[PDB]
Design a protein around this ligand. Structure first.
Ligand SMILES: *[C@@H]1O[C@H](CO)[C@@H](O[C@@H]2O[C@H](CO)[C@@H](O)[C@H](O)[C@H]2NC(C)=O)[C@H](O)[C@H]1NC(C)=O
Ligand SMILES: *[C@@H]1O[C@H](CO)[C@@H](O)[C@H](O)[C@H]1NC(C)=O
Ligand SMILES: *[C@@H]1O[C@H](CO)[C@@H](O)[C@H](O)[C@H]1NC(C)=O
Ligand SMILES: *[C@@H]1O[C@H](CO)[C@@H](O)[C@H](O)[C@H]1NC(C)=O
Ligand SMILES: *[C@@H]1O[C@H](CO)[C@@H](O)[C@H](O)[C@H]1NC(C)=O
Ligand SMILES: *[C@@H]1O[C@H](CO)[C@@H](O)[C@H](O)[C@H]1NC(C)=O
Lengths: 268, 49, 29, 295, 49, 49, 49
């Protein structure tokens, strides 16, 4: 039941200071902590991804590299999960995450995923994959996509663990990627231990019942993490409100070297 | 500032593994047998000296 | 007093002091 | 100035978890058929209490050597990220199963990190893993373009051109698969008989973790210098109430000097501050001993 | 020791190597090499092992 | 000299070498390096560097 | 002269084995395996420090 219905256009915009998450599970307050981890670079050159379905294969899957930052201003019901793996076929294990009205059904089996996978709404997964065998993992928990409001996600595949980070930040009517800082809070961890080099985004589609599916458009953004050293500022209450990327420009390099956010006049 | 900075640098040196497997002595004592525990504490002792 | 003739604008005593005091540098670099 | 005064801890309290599930070590430890060195099977262990005294009680293991942990101290610590691997190798290859060891099975079948911590076990398997006609069920990757990464499995059965003669889909001259079967026979002496090797890969940190030993839980006390154990972390400090707002995903707390100052007990979810017991230098004021002896 | 001329000499019924991989021979530095040459029937080639 | 293969500085570091393929003398010179320094006024005043 | 001799002595110190088998970091990296190579570099770095 694999059908090609999603055609897509790409743009480019600035990441600003989005994509900072909590490196660990330790409480720190009123400190300046410098960490080296996989982050999304400041003012990085992100790709704006515009998938439009109107009632051929024009939705290729995106490489994973060292991790993926995902952002979207769409409503909850529109974007309904992601797909991860290397070959996306039955010869390798694949990880599927599908959010819904009640919760989420994270499941790692050997899926024979479709070229253009999408969830059609009850909910049916037949358009997502044709088969699923040798399933080795499953996890159900409370949904992480719940209702203007930005939804930001960060994924890594580090030493066998499939980390997930999320956060909700309401925004006004300006550039979707706003200024300021809004750290991602860690919400689900995953003992999977599989090889992933390529991912695809899932989209919900409503049957037309009148062109078998209703037309819809979804806007989302895709970044890629790199090994970068950050200097996070934990406030009085232990929340990250500021960060400096040590490898962005000389001023940030000096800020990182002096372990301070203000630099006095001089040569360093 | 010089005095405070020297003291803070001295305190920070306790967090360094200094060629050992763990920078905290209690973990080394509780995890390992005496013959190699002594090796680990020797690395820590000479570094801290 | 400074000597106008010398390009370095140094007094004769200063010139004598400069002269009397003198791949190692590359290796150190 | 003579000495330093310090108040000693009154009593010891040990805090552990409360879940009770015997850990299925028997599944790994009497697995009738074991995986090959190139196709090693890994099993994760979590949410269990681990008793290693039974391993010592009944033990046919000739080689029981641990790299990062003391075997007798195994029951007193809490672990997480715990994996059990499985393979069968030669008798002379047990030395190659170690960090930084150069060997064909080391390079192309099983790599161990330089900073590996855990217990590796080895025992003979002549009775079960050997056959009089030759047990060829175990194969090893002899040829590979590059050395494997630690804890990485190579299954791809790409027919290897062992020379300058292309296979062209026909295995033959200078074309043998990278996997070769061991010629295990009971008649062979030590050093060539099959050996069963299992590595336990506990990742030990300073955290609540999941897996824990058989140590029983004790009640908590407040405002008293006590030496306390929280999931393998041993310290001496007073236990006081907390006003720090700990995040749910957060368990431990560290101060400016990266020192534990607030902890969330696994058995009871509360935040307790760590303050070391009072101490200070002692100075003795005395006149000359000739004049008097009061101090 | 240029093993390439050995490899390219002629099609070989058996090029089995015991104790050493054929690929590493070029990059491995030996002290002495002994070449033993004889003629046997095909059925007894497997006996030379 | 014909026997001499490598040249060394005063401070016992190589400064010259002789190519084995072709009998010529080459001066080994290190790749350029130096300390990067950043000149800036106060961040409160401005951000240019 | 004091400053020049101090620099000369500091540079000269690199050529000494300092209790290790070799004074060349590349040699010890190429010849030997990461554990004992780590031991040798530990000796070299502590001595140079
Ligand atoms: C939202 O997801 C939940 C979980 O997958 C769905 O509830 C499941 O329904 C099936 C019926 O086939 C049961 O077998 C599962 O046990 C249920 N799971 C849980 C966690 O209760 C639910 O139907 C989904 N809702 C929608 C609207 O699709
Ligand atoms: C972002 O990348 C695309 C292609 O990789 C390029 O065309 C675009 O100019 C880049 N934008 C910036 C700001 O560098
Ligand atoms: C995967 O599934 C196929 C068929 O369902 C089966 O033959 C194969 O053994 C399975 N592999 C594993 C590792 O379970
Ligand atoms: C993951 O798969 C890709 C392609 O299948 C491969 O190049 C890569 O080496 C694999 N990862 C590891 C750690 O081997
Ligand atoms: C921190 O928490 C306190 C108490 O809830 C609150 O008054 C304050 O606004 C919060 N933020 C900062 C920056 O102090
Ligand atoms: C037992 O432990 C679980 C989690 O470790 C905890 O949530 C629960 O409250 C505990 N129950 C009792 C009775 O202590």
């Amino acid at each position: 039941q694999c059908v090609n219905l999603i055609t897509r256009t790409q743009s480019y915009t600035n990441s600003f200071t989005r994509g900072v998450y909590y490196p660990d599970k330790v409480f720190r307050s009123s400190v300046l902590h410098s960490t080296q981890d996989l982050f999304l670079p400041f003012f990085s050159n992100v790709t704006w991804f515009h998938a439009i379905h109107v009632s051929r294969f024009d939705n290729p899957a995106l490489p994973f590299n060292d991790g993926v930052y995902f952002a979207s201003t769409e409503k909850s019901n529109i974007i309904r999960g992601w797909i991860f793996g290397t070959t996306l076929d039955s010869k390798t294990q694949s990880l599927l995450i599908v959010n819904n009205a009640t919760n989420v059904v994270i499941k790692v089996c050997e899926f024979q995923f479709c070229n253009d996978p999408f969830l059609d709404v009850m909910e049916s997964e037949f358009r997502v994959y044709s088969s699923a065998n040798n399933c080795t993992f499953e996890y159900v928990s409370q949904p992480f996509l719940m209702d203007k409001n930005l939804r930001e996600f960060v994924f890594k595949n580090i030493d066998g663990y499939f980390k997930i980070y999320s956060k909700h930040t309401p925004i006004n009517l300006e550039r979707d990627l706003p200024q300021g800082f809004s750290a991602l809070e860690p919400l689900v961890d995953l003992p999977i231990g599989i090889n992933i080099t390529r991912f695809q985004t899932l989209l919900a589609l409503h049957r037309s019942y009148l062109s078998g599916w209703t037309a819809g458009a979804a806007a989302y953004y895709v970044g890629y993490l790199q090994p970068r050293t950050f200097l996070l500022k934990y406030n009085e209450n232990g929340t990250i409100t500021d960060a400096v990327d040590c490898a962005l420009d000389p001023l940030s390099e000096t800020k990182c070297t002096l372990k301070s956010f203000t630099v006095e006049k001089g040569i360093y | 500032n010089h005095n405070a900075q020297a003291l803070n640098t001295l305190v920070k040196q306790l967090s360094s593994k200094f060629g050992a497997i763990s920078s905290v002595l209690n973990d080394i004592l509780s995890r390992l047998d005496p013959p190699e525990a002594e090796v680990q504490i020797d690395r820590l002792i000479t570094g801290r000296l | 007093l400074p000597d106008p003739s010398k390009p370095s604008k140094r007094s004769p005593i200063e010139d004598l002091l400069f002269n009397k005091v003198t791949d190692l540098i590359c290796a150190q670099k | 100035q003579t000495s330093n005064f310090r108040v000693q801890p009154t009593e010891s309290i040990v805090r552990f978890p409360n879940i009770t599930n015997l850990c299925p070590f028997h599944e790994v430890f009497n697995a009738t058929t074991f995986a090959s060195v190139y196709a090693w099977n890994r099993k994760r262990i979590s949410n269990c209490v681990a008793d290693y005294s039974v391993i010592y009680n009944f033990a046919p293991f000739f080689a029981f050597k641990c790299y990062g942990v003391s075997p007798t101290k195994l029951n007193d610590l809490c672990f997480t990220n715990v994996y059990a691997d499985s393979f069968v190798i030669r008798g002379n290859e047990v030395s190659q199963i170690a960090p930084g060891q150069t060997g064909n099975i080391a390079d192309y079948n099983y790599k161990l990190p330089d900073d590996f911590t855990g217990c590796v076990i080895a025992w003979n398997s002549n009775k079960l893993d050997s056959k009089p006609s030759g047990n060829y069920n175990y194969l090893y990757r002899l040829f590979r373009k590059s050395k494997l990464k630690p804890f990485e499995r190579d299954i791809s059965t790409e027919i290897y051109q062992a020379g300058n003669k292309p296979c062209n889909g026909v295995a033959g001259p200078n074309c043998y698969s990278p996997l070769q079967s061991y010629g295990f026979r009971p008649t062979y002496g030590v050093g060539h008989q099959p050996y069963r090797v299992v590595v336990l890969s506990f990742e030990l940190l300073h955290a609540p973790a999941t897996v824990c030993g058989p140590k029983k839980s004790t009640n908590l006390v407040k405002n008293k210098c006590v030496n306390f154990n929280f999931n393998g972390l041993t310290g001496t400090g007073v236990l006081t109430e907390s006003n720090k707002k700990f995040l749910p995903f957060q368990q431990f707390g560290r101060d400016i000097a990266d020192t534990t100052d607030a902890v969330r007990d696994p058995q009871t979810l509360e935040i307790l501050d760590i303050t070391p017991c009072s101490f200070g230098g002692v100075s003795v004021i005395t006149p000359g001993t000739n004049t008097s002896n009061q101090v």
